[PDB]
Amino acid sequence: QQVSVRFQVHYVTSTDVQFIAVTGDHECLGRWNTYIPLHYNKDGFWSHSIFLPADTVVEWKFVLVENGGVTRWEECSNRFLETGHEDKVVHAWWGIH
Ligand SMILES: OC[C@H]1O[C@H](O[C@H]2[C@H](O)[C@@H](O)[C@@H](O[C@H]3[C@H](O)[C@@H](O)[C@@H](O[C@H]4[C@H](O)[C@@H](O)[C@@H](O)O[C@@H]4CO)O[C@@H]3CO)O[C@@H]2CO)[C@H](O)[C@@H](O)[C@@H]1O
Ligand SMILES: OC[C@H]1O[C@H](O[C@H]2[C@H](O)[C@@H](O)[C@@H](O[C@H]3[C@H](O)[C@@H](O)[C@@H](O[C@H]4[C@H](O)[C@@H](O)[C@@H](O)O[C@@H]4CO)O[C@@H]3CO)O[C@@H]2CO)[C@H](O)[C@@H](O)[C@@H]1O
């Protein structure tokens, strides 16, 4: 079974070709090699909903992406997420567990 998790972070980019994405240790998160782009909303928020395996534990990070690759990793250690089995929002602050 799957669960829908909405990731959200505030980040002001400098140019229109940069964007924020999520990556992590699960296949659904790119296995640290690829990333899932977030989308920009009103008020400088980046948000997107990702389907994750239910009732498990995954490690992940926000990344900043430009010209096809990560130009900046979040400076904290890997974050842990208990995915649960109810749809939910994970609001985070860049660089802070
Ligand atoms: O064998 C492959 C490894 O795969 C996994 O490692 C992951 C890490 O868990 C992830 O966190 C990420 O690593 C990023 C890291 O998050 C990021 O901060 C950056 O680390 C740099 C850092 O800028 C700086 O301190 C510099 O000195 O070097 C650091 C490490 O290179 O970049 C890292 C990625 O390059 O992704 C890696 C895999 O790419 C797994 O957990 C490991 O056990 C495994 O060895
Ligand atoms: O003592 C620690 C720090 O305390 C204070 O920092 C505050 C900021 O003032 C707050 O605005 C917020 O910071 C957020 C920020 O709002 C959010 O946009 C994002 O910042 C990005 C930035 O948009 C982007 O352009 C790029 O430059 O990187 C930034 C992150 O590195 O995330 C920030 C936090 O992750 O909260 C912090 C406290 O956590 C004080 O102003 C700092 O000088 C001080 O170091």
What token pair was written down for 68? Answer: 């096809």
Yes or no: say if 64 and 72 are a contact pair by the CB < 8 Å rule. yes
Using alpha carbons, select from 54, 59, 97 the residue that is nearest to residue 75. 97
What token pair was written down for 66? Answer: 């430009």
Q: Which residue ranges make up each domain of the chain?
A: 2-91
Task: Give the resolution value in Å.
Answer: 2.1
Q: Which 3 state secondary structure label does DSSP give 86?
A: coil
Ligand 1 atom 2 nearest Cα: 32
Q: How many residues are there in the chain?
A: 97
Which residue has tokens 């490690």? 59
For 15, list phi and psi in degrees, rounded to 5: -130, 165
Report which DSSP code applies to 96: B
Check pocket membership of 80 for ligand 2, CB cut-off 6 A: no
Ligand 1, residue 59: give the atom nearest the CA.
Answer: 9
Residues ≥6 apart with Cβ < 8 Å to 16: none
Pocket test for ligand 2, best of 14, 94, 97 (most atoms within 8 A of CB): 94
Using alpha carbons, select from 51, 20, 46, 57 the residue that is nearest to residue 35. 20
Which residue type sits at 65? V
Task: Tell me which fold the domain 2-91 belongs to.
Answer: Immunoglobulin-like (2.60.40)
